[PDB]
Amino acid sequence: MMAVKKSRKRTAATELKKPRRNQLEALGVTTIDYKDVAVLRTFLSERGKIRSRHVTGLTPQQQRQVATAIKNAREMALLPMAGP
Amino acid sequence: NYIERVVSINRVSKVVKGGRRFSFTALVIVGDGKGMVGVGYGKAKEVPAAIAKGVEEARKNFFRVPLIGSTITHPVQGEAAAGVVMLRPASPGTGVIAGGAARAVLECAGVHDILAKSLGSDNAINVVHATVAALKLLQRPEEVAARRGLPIEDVAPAGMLKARRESEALAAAAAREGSA
Amino acid sequence: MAVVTMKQLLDSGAHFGHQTRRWNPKMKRFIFTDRNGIYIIDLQQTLTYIDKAYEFVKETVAHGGTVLFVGTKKQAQESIAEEATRVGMPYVNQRWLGGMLTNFSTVHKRLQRLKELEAMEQTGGFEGRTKKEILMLTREKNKLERSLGGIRDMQKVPSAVWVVDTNKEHIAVGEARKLGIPVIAILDTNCDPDVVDYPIPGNDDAIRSAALLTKVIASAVAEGLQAR
Amino acid sequence: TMTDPIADFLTRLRNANSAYHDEVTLPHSKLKANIAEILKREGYISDYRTEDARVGKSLVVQLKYGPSRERSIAGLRRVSKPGLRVYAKSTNLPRVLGGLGVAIISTSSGLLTDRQAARQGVGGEVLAYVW
RNA sequence: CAGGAUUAGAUACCCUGGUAGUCCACGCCGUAAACGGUGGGUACUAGGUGUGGGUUUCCUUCCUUGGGAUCCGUGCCGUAGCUA
């Protein structure tokens, strides 16, 4: 019915696309906590490493907050870090 | 009738596998002796060819000058690439005081009583270009009164107008002795 | 004096023309207002400059100058062709040559060789030389005819009057303003406007507006010649 | 910081003349006003006026361009600058362009062009050259 | 620094080993391409474009590189202007 751009029809969309994304305030969130590992496992790979911003979409604020949480989690072994 | 000059001849050389494919340049200035001034940088393998190019290109690129009888209006600074020149009017009977390049320019233009000084970029090319820039920076008092709405009396002093009147008198004398 | 009235002009639209990432006049009078991230006609200015250029060219063409229908933009090719048919003038379609108006005396020789080759064609000497060379002459003639029609009737110290595809052939303006004669084109609307003596706003792309105003200037020339 | 408001005035007019702007905007001062009135007299600019702003007044100047967009002001320059305060006797007044252009003197009789100052006989501080 | 190998010869690159040093505390010296090879402070001076941070209004879902304006910092292109 409508195109991904040339959105001359609805208001300025409260929706996200492939270039634009703020994935946490978007959806998939309760709150940034090192406790909730099922959520933090989404910003990784199967090899445990961490994504980038031009992969995910986050602002640096959320990015660094989440990375610190991840790293605390690996320290308290709540999350399977990559290793032997 | 035209007055013409040859005031620079260097022996240039592009370089190529055989050797040096020489060539010749020239700098030529033209002037009626009344205010028309033209400039040309002609070159060729042949010196007459370069000279003739300079001639015709000067006859293309004239430029009129704000004269008063035989002398300029005001002093001026002319900047070119690095050519600096400080022209300045004389009082009549003084002479065309300048070096080689500017002397050629002004003597061809028709000046007879003027000062000048080269302060940088001794090269004739940039010297001539700077002199020309100065002559462009010149302004006629008529056009000054035009652009700022006032009349010539409030715009100029009295001595310049003395010069105007006396030179118009000499000119009408010359023309009325010539034809009439 | 207007040419077309308000509502007939608003049928075709009086808003068009170009995107925001490219403009730079200094004239906030031509610059209309930000709408949809895009700018608009100032009909006051537009009709003013139209009447101004129109009276200028009425004077010049009751004196009886001449300009011809050379083509550069695909949007104006057939437009210029049909107005060439009906106003009678020769036309040209494809390409701009570097240095017509400046080096006119060499393209004059190009016309002379065009005449020579057409004379060969008319007299009919083809198998006097190689078939391949005659085919290459056909190549020469197609190229020379697509790139040259106007000199075939110019001959006559051309006036720097009119402009074809300004922004992309800026190279056609310095060939004109070098000599300084009054230039005109419907503004290619993301350009330096205040070079040209007689500017006229409009569009850069639209086939419809461009054919319209080509018919307008065709009409101007027609009236100048008619009341010569 | 700011130290030379008169240079600000003059340079601003120079910049705006080069950018071909129509009208200028400054804060206001008596000295700037007298300068502007003298220029409006001598012919360089069309008109000035005093609008206002949040904390203080403000000048607005209306320039003067040719019909063919010929700038009316060629050159412009401050002379007596802080540091080198240049003063002038009537005997040794500056002559600009042989007298075509204009000096702007500050004297017991107020701001005056060089001719008016000479006819009165007075002299004093110089402020600027204009042409 | 010792040895191996290349080498015309190799006090050198390459290989094997390997001390001072790199590290910590407390003091010293006080220099470099310590570079934007651009001293600091300040006003005006065409724009476009990405980008980091914080304000704010409208289509408003008002969960949005939302969009616009604004302020600060940061990069690219580019007028006039300037420069050998």
PDB file of C-alpha atoms in Angstrom, chain B:
ATOM      1  CA  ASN B   1      48.415  55.019 -35.923  1.00  0.00           C
ATOM      2  CA  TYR B   2      49.506  53.013 -32.887  1.00  0.00           C
ATOM      3  CA  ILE B   3      52.574  52.936 -30.673  1.00  0.00           C
ATOM      4  CA  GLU B   4      53.961  49.468 -29.987  1.00  0.00           C
ATOM      5  CA  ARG B   5      56.635  47.919 -27.802  1.00  0.00           C
ATOM      6  CA  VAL B   6      58.905  44.962 -27.243  1.00  0.00           C
ATOM      7  CA  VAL B   7      60.064  44.897 -23.637  1.00  0.00           C
ATOM      8  CA  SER B   8      60.870  41.261 -22.845  1.00  0.00           C
ATOM      9  CA  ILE B   9      62.408  38.423 -24.826  1.00  0.00           C
ATOM     10  CA  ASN B  10      63.275  35.202 -23.008  1.00  0.00           C
ATOM     11  CA  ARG B  11      64.374  31.942 -24.646  1.00  0.00           C
ATOM     12  CA  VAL B  12      62.139  29.184 -23.287  1.00  0.00           C
ATOM     13  CA  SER B  13      62.532  25.424 -23.696  1.00  0.00           C
ATOM     14  CA  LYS B  14      60.206  22.537 -23.314  1.00  0.00           C
ATOM     15  CA  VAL B  15      62.286  19.396 -22.894  1.00  0.00           C
ATOM     16  CA  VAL B  16      61.714  16.135 -24.722  1.00  0.00           C
ATOM     17  CA  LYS B  17      63.548  12.878 -25.389  1.00  0.00           C
ATOM     18  CA  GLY B  18      65.462  14.196 -28.372  1.00  0.00           C
ATOM     19  CA  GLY B  19      66.413  17.320 -26.523  1.00  0.00           C
ATOM     20  CA  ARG B  20      65.255  20.896 -26.165  1.00  0.00           C
ATOM     21  CA  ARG B  21      62.434  22.145 -28.394  1.00  0.00           C
ATOM     22  CA  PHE B  22      63.172  25.804 -27.882  1.00  0.00           C
ATOM     23  CA  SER B  23      60.714  28.636 -28.412  1.00  0.00           C
ATOM     24  CA  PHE B  24      60.468  32.384 -28.024  1.00  0.00           C
ATOM     25  CA  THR B  25      58.194  34.656 -26.069  1.00  0.00           C
ATOM     26  CA  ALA B  26      57.498  38.346 -26.010  1.00  0.00           C
ATOM     27  CA  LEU B  27      55.619  40.965 -24.042  1.00  0.00           C
ATOM     28  CA  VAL B  28      54.033  43.727 -26.065  1.00  0.00           C
ATOM     29  CA  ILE B  29      52.295  46.916 -25.001  1.00  0.00           C
ATOM     30  CA  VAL B  30      50.212  49.131 -27.262  1.00  0.00           C
ATOM     31  CA  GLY B  31      48.872  52.606 -26.736  1.00  0.00           C
ATOM     32  CA  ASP B  32      47.449  55.423 -28.806  1.00  0.00           C
ATOM     33  CA  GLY B  33      49.153  57.953 -26.549  1.00  0.00           C
ATOM     34  CA  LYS B  34      45.723  59.216 -25.465  1.00  0.00           C
ATOM     35  CA  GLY B  35      44.369  56.683 -22.948  1.00  0.00           C
ATOM     36  CA  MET B  36      43.965  53.405 -24.828  1.00  0.00           C
ATOM     37  CA  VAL B  37      46.298  50.740 -23.449  1.00  0.00           C
ATOM     38  CA  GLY B  38      46.588  47.108 -24.452  1.00  0.00           C
ATOM     39  CA  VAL B  39      48.774  44.237 -23.345  1.00  0.00           C
ATOM     40  CA  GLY B  40      49.797  40.929 -24.866  1.00  0.00           C
ATOM     41  CA  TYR B  41      52.023  37.958 -24.058  1.00  0.00           C
ATOM     42  CA  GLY B  42      52.837  36.474 -27.427  1.00  0.00           C
ATOM     43  CA  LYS B  43      55.047  33.493 -28.082  1.00  0.00           C
ATOM     44  CA  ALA B  44      56.184  31.325 -30.969  1.00  0.00           C
ATOM     45  CA  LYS B  45      59.191  29.572 -32.408  1.00  0.00           C
ATOM     46  CA  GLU B  46      59.521  32.869 -34.312  1.00  0.00           C
ATOM     47  CA  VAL B  47      60.187  36.255 -32.728  1.00  0.00           C
ATOM     48  CA  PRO B  48      58.153  38.222 -35.315  1.00  0.00           C
ATOM     49  CA  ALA B  49      55.326  35.735 -34.802  1.00  0.00           C
ATOM     50  CA  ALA B  50      55.310  36.281 -31.042  1.00  0.00           C
ATOM     51  CA  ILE B  51      55.555  40.030 -31.580  1.00  0.00           C
ATOM     52  CA  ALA B  52      52.600  40.024 -33.968  1.00  0.00           C
ATOM     53  CA  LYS B  53      50.546  37.958 -31.546  1.00  0.00           C
ATOM     54  CA  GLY B  54      51.321  40.474 -28.822  1.00  0.00           C
ATOM     55  CA  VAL B  55      50.317  43.273 -31.191  1.00  0.00           C
ATOM     56  CA  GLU B  56      46.947  41.835 -32.133  1.00  0.00           C
ATOM     57  CA  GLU B  57      46.178  40.720 -28.582  1.00  0.00           C
ATOM     58  CA  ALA B  58      46.921  44.179 -27.257  1.00  0.00           C
ATOM     59  CA  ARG B  59      44.633  45.581 -29.948  1.00  0.00           C
ATOM     60  CA  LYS B  60      42.028  43.194 -28.566  1.00  0.00           C
ATOM     61  CA  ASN B  61      42.412  43.933 -24.865  1.00  0.00           C
ATOM     62  CA  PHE B  62      42.457  47.709 -24.655  1.00  0.00           C
ATOM     63  CA  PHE B  63      41.592  49.625 -21.494  1.00  0.00           C
ATOM     64  CA  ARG B  64      40.664  53.279 -21.125  1.00  0.00           C
ATOM     65  CA  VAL B  65      42.333  55.402 -18.457  1.00  0.00           C
ATOM     66  CA  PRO B  66      41.036  58.232 -16.206  1.00  0.00           C
ATOM     67  CA  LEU B  67      43.451  60.922 -17.354  1.00  0.00           C
ATOM     68  CA  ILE B  68      43.642  64.632 -16.676  1.00  0.00           C
ATOM     69  CA  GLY B  69      45.409  66.380 -19.518  1.00  0.00           C
ATOM     70  CA  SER B  70      48.734  64.635 -19.037  1.00  0.00           C
ATOM     71  CA  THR B  71      48.596  63.263 -15.479  1.00  0.00           C
ATOM     72  CA  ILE B  72      46.613  60.830 -13.340  1.00  0.00           C
ATOM     73  CA  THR B  73      44.038  61.755 -10.724  1.00  0.00           C
ATOM     74  CA  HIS B  74      45.339  60.210  -7.504  1.00  0.00           C
ATOM     75  CA  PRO B  75      48.048  57.900  -6.200  1.00  0.00           C
ATOM     76  CA  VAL B  76      47.264  54.232  -5.939  1.00  0.00           C
ATOM     77  CA  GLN B  77      48.620  50.819  -4.967  1.00  0.00           C
ATOM     78  CA  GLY B  78      48.398  48.125  -7.618  1.00  0.00           C
ATOM     79  CA  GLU B  79      48.750  44.469  -6.693  1.00  0.00           C
ATOM     80  CA  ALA B  80      49.354  41.627  -9.123  1.00  0.00           C
ATOM     81  CA  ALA B  81      50.805  38.161  -8.393  1.00  0.00           C
ATOM     82  CA  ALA B  82      53.430  39.977  -6.384  1.00  0.00           C
ATOM     83  CA  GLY B  83      53.904  43.142  -8.440  1.00  0.00           C
ATOM     84  CA  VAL B  84      53.485  46.138  -6.186  1.00  0.00           C
ATOM     85  CA  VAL B  85      53.398  49.604  -7.717  1.00  0.00           C
ATOM     86  CA  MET B  86      52.868  53.002  -6.093  1.00  0.00           C
ATOM     87  CA  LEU B  87      51.786  55.357  -8.844  1.00  0.00           C
ATOM     88  CA  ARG B  88      51.316  58.987  -8.001  1.00  0.00           C
ATOM     89  CA  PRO B  89      50.642  62.158 -10.005  1.00  0.00           C
ATOM     90  CA  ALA B  90      53.333  64.671 -10.801  1.00  0.00           C
ATOM     91  CA  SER B  91      53.184  68.348 -11.580  1.00  0.00           C
ATOM     92  CA  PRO B  92      53.434  69.127 -15.278  1.00  0.00           C
ATOM     93  CA  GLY B  93      56.839  69.237 -16.907  1.00  0.00           C
ATOM     94  CA  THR B  94      58.185  66.545 -14.556  1.00  0.00           C
ATOM     95  CA  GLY B  95      58.500  63.540 -16.875  1.00  0.00           C
ATOM     96  CA  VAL B  96      57.470  59.911 -17.204  1.00  0.00           C
ATOM     97  CA  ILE B  97      59.340  58.689 -14.149  1.00  0.00           C
ATOM     98  CA  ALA B  98      59.441  54.895 -14.005  1.00  0.00           C
ATOM     99  CA  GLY B  99      61.625  51.944 -14.930  1.00  0.00           C
ATOM    100  CA  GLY B 100      61.368  49.984 -18.150  1.00  0.00           C
ATOM    101  CA  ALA B 101      58.039  48.207 -18.020  1.00  0.00           C
ATOM    102  CA  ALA B 102      55.867  50.879 -16.470  1.00  0.00           C
ATOM    103  CA  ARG B 103      57.665  53.458 -18.583  1.00  0.00           C
ATOM    104  CA  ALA B 104      56.654  51.562 -21.702  1.00  0.00           C
ATOM    105  CA  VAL B 105      53.078  51.260 -20.443  1.00  0.00           C
ATOM    106  CA  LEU B 106      52.621  54.889 -19.543  1.00  0.00           C
ATOM    107  CA  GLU B 107      54.497  56.403 -22.477  1.00  0.00           C
ATOM    108  CA  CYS B 108      52.324  54.333 -24.803  1.00  0.00           C
ATOM    109  CA  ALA B 109      49.213  55.310 -22.855  1.00  0.00           C
ATOM    110  CA  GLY B 110      49.935  59.016 -23.289  1.00  0.00           C
ATOM    111  CA  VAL B 111      51.114  60.024 -19.824  1.00  0.00           C
ATOM    112  CA  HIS B 112      53.886  62.631 -19.688  1.00  0.00           C
ATOM    113  CA  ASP B 113      54.214  63.534 -15.991  1.00  0.00           C
ATOM    114  CA  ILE B 114      53.846  60.796 -13.389  1.00  0.00           C
ATOM    115  CA  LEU B 115      55.693  58.883 -10.686  1.00  0.00           C
ATOM    116  CA  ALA B 116      56.020  55.181 -10.013  1.00  0.00           C
ATOM    117  CA  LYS B 117      58.019  52.613  -8.074  1.00  0.00           C
ATOM    118  CA  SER B 118      58.499  48.844  -8.210  1.00  0.00           C
ATOM    119  CA  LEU B 119      58.637  47.289  -4.746  1.00  0.00           C
ATOM    120  CA  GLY B 120      58.368  43.562  -5.415  1.00  0.00           C
ATOM    121  CA  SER B 121      58.287  41.070  -8.265  1.00  0.00           C
ATOM    122  CA  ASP B 122      60.884  42.705 -10.484  1.00  0.00           C
ATOM    123  CA  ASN B 123      59.625  40.564 -13.377  1.00  0.00           C
ATOM    124  CA  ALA B 124      58.151  42.654 -16.171  1.00  0.00           C
ATOM    125  CA  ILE B 125      55.103  40.387 -16.466  1.00  0.00           C
ATOM    126  CA  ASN B 126      53.735  40.888 -12.989  1.00  0.00           C
ATOM    127  CA  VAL B 127      54.931  44.497 -12.984  1.00  0.00           C
ATOM    128  CA  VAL B 128      52.787  45.259 -16.010  1.00  0.00           C
ATOM    129  CA  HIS B 129      49.826  43.374 -14.572  1.00  0.00           C
ATOM    130  CA  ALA B 130      50.080  45.354 -11.340  1.00  0.00           C
ATOM    131  CA  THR B 131      50.294  48.666 -13.170  1.00  0.00           C
ATOM    132  CA  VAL B 132      47.168  47.664 -15.064  1.00  0.00           C
ATOM    133  CA  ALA B 133      45.396  46.738 -11.825  1.00  0.00           C
ATOM    134  CA  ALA B 134      46.234  50.205 -10.527  1.00  0.00           C
ATOM    135  CA  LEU B 135      44.857  51.880 -13.637  1.00  0.00           C
ATOM    136  CA  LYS B 136      41.672  49.893 -13.070  1.00  0.00           C
ATOM    137  CA  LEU B 137      41.509  50.996  -9.440  1.00  0.00           C
ATOM    138  CA  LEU B 138      41.541  54.567 -10.729  1.00  0.00           C
ATOM    139  CA  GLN B 139      38.250  56.467 -10.782  1.00  0.00           C
ATOM    140  CA  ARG B 140      37.038  59.533 -12.539  1.00  0.00           C
ATOM    141  CA  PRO B 141      35.681  62.266 -10.243  1.00  0.00           C
ATOM    142  CA  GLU B 142      32.608  62.383 -12.460  1.00  0.00           C
ATOM    143  CA  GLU B 143      31.869  58.733 -11.731  1.00  0.00           C
ATOM    144  CA  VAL B 144      32.576  59.350  -8.052  1.00  0.00           C
ATOM    145  CA  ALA B 145      29.997  62.141  -7.901  1.00  0.00           C
ATOM    146  CA  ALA B 146      27.727  59.757  -9.792  1.00  0.00           C
ATOM    147  CA  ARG B 147      28.037  56.838  -7.400  1.00  0.00           C
ATOM    148  CA  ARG B 148      27.647  58.994  -4.279  1.00  0.00           C
ATOM    149  CA  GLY B 149      25.038  61.439  -5.596  1.00  0.00           C
ATOM    150  CA  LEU B 150      26.904  64.661  -4.775  1.00  0.00           C
ATOM    151  CA  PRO B 151      28.221  67.247  -7.268  1.00  0.00           C
ATOM    152  CA  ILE B 152      31.767  67.730  -8.479  1.00  0.00           C
ATOM    153  CA  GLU B 153      32.334  70.800  -6.319  1.00  0.00           C
ATOM    154  CA  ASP B 154      31.754  69.070  -2.992  1.00  0.00           C
ATOM    155  CA  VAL B 155      33.449  65.971  -4.434  1.00  0.00           C
ATOM    156  CA  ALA B 156      36.746  67.489  -5.653  1.00  0.00           C
ATOM    157  CA  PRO B 157      39.120  70.299  -4.638  1.00  0.00           C
ATOM    158  CA  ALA B 158      39.820  73.389  -6.738  1.00  0.00           C
ATOM    159  CA  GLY B 159      43.270  72.654  -8.167  1.00  0.00           C
ATOM    160  CA  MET B 160      42.156  69.573 -10.058  1.00  0.00           C
ATOM    161  CA  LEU B 161      39.395  71.652 -11.633  1.00  0.00           C
ATOM    162  CA  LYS B 162      41.938  74.318 -12.560  1.00  0.00           C
ATOM    163  CA  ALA B 163      43.802  71.571 -14.392  1.00  0.00           C
ATOM    164  CA  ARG B 164      40.584  70.416 -16.085  1.00  0.00           C
ATOM    165  CA  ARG B 165      39.719  73.878 -17.365  1.00  0.00           C
ATOM    166  CA  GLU B 166      43.213  74.715 -18.561  1.00  0.00           C
ATOM    167  CA  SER B 167      43.641  71.400 -20.350  1.00  0.00           C
ATOM    168  CA  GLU B 168      40.262  71.747 -22.062  1.00  0.00           C
ATOM    169  CA  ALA B 169      41.413  75.190 -23.169  1.00  0.00           C
ATOM    170  CA  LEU B 170      44.649  73.815 -24.630  1.00  0.00           C
ATOM    171  CA  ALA B 171      42.729  71.001 -26.326  1.00  0.00           C
ATOM    172  CA  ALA B 172      40.142  73.275 -27.932  1.00  0.00           C
ATOM    173  CA  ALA B 173      43.045  75.482 -29.013  1.00  0.00           C
ATOM    174  CA  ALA B 174      44.834  72.559 -30.671  1.00  0.00           C
ATOM    175  CA  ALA B 175      41.712  71.304 -32.444  1.00  0.00           C
ATOM    176  CA  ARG B 176      40.583  74.754 -33.599  1.00  0.00           C
ATOM    177  CA  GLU B 177      44.063  75.461 -34.957  1.00  0.00           C
ATOM    178  CA  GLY B 178      44.053  72.048 -36.643  1.00  0.00           C
ATOM    179  CA  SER B 179      40.729  72.087 -38.488  1.00  0.00           C
ATOM    180  CA  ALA B 180      39.286  75.575 -38.007  1.00  0.00           C
TER     181      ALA B 180
END
